[PDB]
From a paper:
The helicase domain of nonstructural protein 3 (NS3H) unwinds the double-stranded RNA replication intermediate in an ATP-dependent manner during the flavivirus life cycle. In this study, we focus on NS3H, which is a monomeric enzyme belonging to the DEAD/H box subfamily within the helicase superfamily 2 (SF2) and consists of three subdomains. The NTPase active site is located in a cleft between the subdomains 1 and 2 and involves motifs I (Walker A), II (Walker B), and VI. Here, we biochemically characterized NS3H from TBEV and obtained structures of key intermediates along the ATPase cycle (nucleotide-free, apo; ADP-; adenylyl-imidodiphosphate, AMPPNP-; and hydrolysis product, ADP–Pi-bound NS3H).
The apoNS3H protein crystallizes in space group P41212 at 1.83 Å. The refined model of apoNS3H (residues 173–621) is complete except for an N-terminal 10X-histidine tag region derived from the pET-19b vector together with a short flexible linker region between protease and helicase domains of NS3 (residues E173–Q181) and two nonconserved disordered loop regions (residues P251–G259 and T502–P506). Nonprotein positive 2Fo–Fc electron density was attributed to water molecules. NS3H has a clover-shaped architecture divided into three domains containing seven conserved motifs of SF2 helicase family. Domain 1 (residues W188–E329) consists of six β-strands surrounded by four α-helices, whereas domain 2 (residues P330–G486) consists of three α-helices and six β-strands with one antiparallel β hairpin passing close to domain 3. Domain 3 (residues L487–R621) consists of four α-helices and one β-hairpin. The empty NTPase site is filled with solvent molecules, and the P-loop adopts a “relaxed” conformation as found in ZIKV structure, whereas DENV helicase exhibits yet more open conformation. The resulting 3D protein structure shows overall similarity with already published helicase structures of other flaviviruses.
Numbering used by the authors: 182 to 250, 260 to 501, 507 to 621
């Protein structure tokens, strides 16, 4: 344990920065809840992912905790907390809030910590943030439970043949972080034609396929940033090119082109996959430097869209500089918020797309915005022909949305699901 009491006093903000593998989920979290239950405080616990929520349920074995897909402790995902507050008829209160993996730059995660920070600064709760890389200044090589030898090497950015023998001559298991699902597939194919087993983890596969890692012990896990929020990959080496995809609003559209250097918090979390056990020395092989200035990413606008609709609120204080507009800018009328919530939760829309649709379109039944956009917004398959579909009246449409978000058409979303919506089947 790190803190005694007073941590549950209204207006207290506590940051627990504990290294991975020193018993946070199964030692520290269960002691914090014991205290809450003993003091009879309505406690909220936020997990980043279903994988971590399930792990919390095992560690909180034998307490009155309510887990969400007569107890005073509720456990749910970051995203569940925020999505619930999008119904103004929703909005239960807790006096203590514990947020696990509180560094995540997912918009729901940013909005949750901002909302809870706002409440605690007004003395409506206590807030614990559990993360090795708290928002604010980060170190790329923070302390670990066991040794990590970190070395800079050139890392392949796609398929290779010769010149990188150190990758495949290695005897232990490796996690290789990649900036995108597409780049992952290239790396995965090359490793497999060099005789290695590979599992790919990303936004799309993580919830389902995390368990194959433990079960199948592949030579390589080729992973996106999805493994930076509590994933135990049980590897002895990380390979980290220190890049990520850069979703950005450019000329009124969300683009996904090229990469950014990771933030130092990301680099530390990637490295943080190893060094979990004392008595053994692991390896972190990386290429190049970090860039902490991610203020350009659309995630901050999306965090504001959510925060303005679950609520003067601020982001979690160091992050407030990254709020792109005046607080409240994106607030919707109750009726439009209901549309917004449906698009997020039932149609798998990004916050950016769901906001533009709900703010602007007349009725929840209109689909004409999906074909009435400017010509340059038309959506192509990888084969080069523009996507077409039929409206219920048999009219042939070209997919050409008024608001274009590249994330709807690749990187773990399929054109086919968006066409289900556009054709009025969803």
């Amino acid at each position: 344990a790190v803190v005694g009491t007073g941590w549950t006093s209204k207006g207290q903000i506590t940051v627990l920065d504990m290294h991975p593998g020193s018993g946070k989920t199964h030692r520290v979290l269960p002691e914090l809840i014991r205290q809450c239950i003993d003091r009879r405080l309505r406690t909220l616990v936020l997990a980043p992912t279903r994988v971590v929520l399930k792990e919390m349920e095992r560690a909180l074995n034998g307490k009155r905790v309510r887990f969400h897909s007569g107890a005073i402790v509720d456990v749910m995902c970051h995203a569940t907390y925020v999505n619930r507050r999008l119904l103004p008829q929703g909005r239960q209160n807790w006096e203590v809030a514990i947020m696990d993996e509180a560094h995540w730059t997912d918009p729901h995660s940013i909005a949750a910590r901002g909302h809870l920070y706002t409440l605690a600064k007004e003395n409506k709760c206590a807030l614990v943030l559990m993360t090795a890389t708290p928002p604010g200044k980060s170190e790329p090589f923070p302390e670990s439970n066991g040794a990590i030898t970190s070395e800079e090497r050139q890392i392949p950015d796609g398929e290779w043949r010769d010149g990188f023998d150190w990758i495949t001559e290695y005897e232990g298991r490796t996690a290789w972080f990649v900036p995108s699902i597409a780049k992952g597939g290239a790396i995965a194919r090359t490793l497999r034609q060099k005789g290695k087993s590979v599992i790919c983890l990303n936004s799309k596969t993580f919830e389902k396929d995390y368990s194959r890692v433990r079960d199948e012990k592949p030579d390589f896990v080729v992973t996106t940033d999805i493994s930076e929020m509590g994933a135990n990959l049980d590897v002895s080496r990380v390979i980290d090119g220190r890049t990520n995809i850069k979703p950005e609003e450019v000329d009124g559209k969300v683009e996904l082109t090229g990469t950014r250097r990771v933030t130092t918090a990301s680099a530390a979390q990637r490295r943080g996959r190893v060094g979990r056990q004392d008595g053994r020395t692991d390896e972190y092989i990386y290429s190049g430097q970090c860039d902490d200035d991610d203020s350009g990413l659309v995630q901050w606008k999306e965090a504001q869209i959510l925060l303005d609709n679950i609520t003067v609120a601020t982001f979690y204080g160091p992050e407030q500089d990254k709020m792109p507009e005046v607080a409240g800018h994106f607030r919707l009328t109750e009726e439009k918020r209901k549309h917004f919530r449906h698009l997020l939760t039932h149609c798998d829309f990004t916050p950016w797309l769901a906001w533009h649709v709900a703010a602007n379109v007349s009725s929840v039944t209109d689909r004409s915005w999906t074909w009435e956009g400017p010509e340059a917004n038309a959506v192509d398959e990888a084969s080069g022909d523009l996507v077409t579909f039929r409206s219920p009246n048999g009219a042939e449409r070209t997919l050409r949305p008024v608001w274009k978000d590249a994330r709807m058409f690749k990187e773990g979303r399929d054109i086919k699901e968006f066409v289900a919506y556009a054709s009025g089947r969803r």
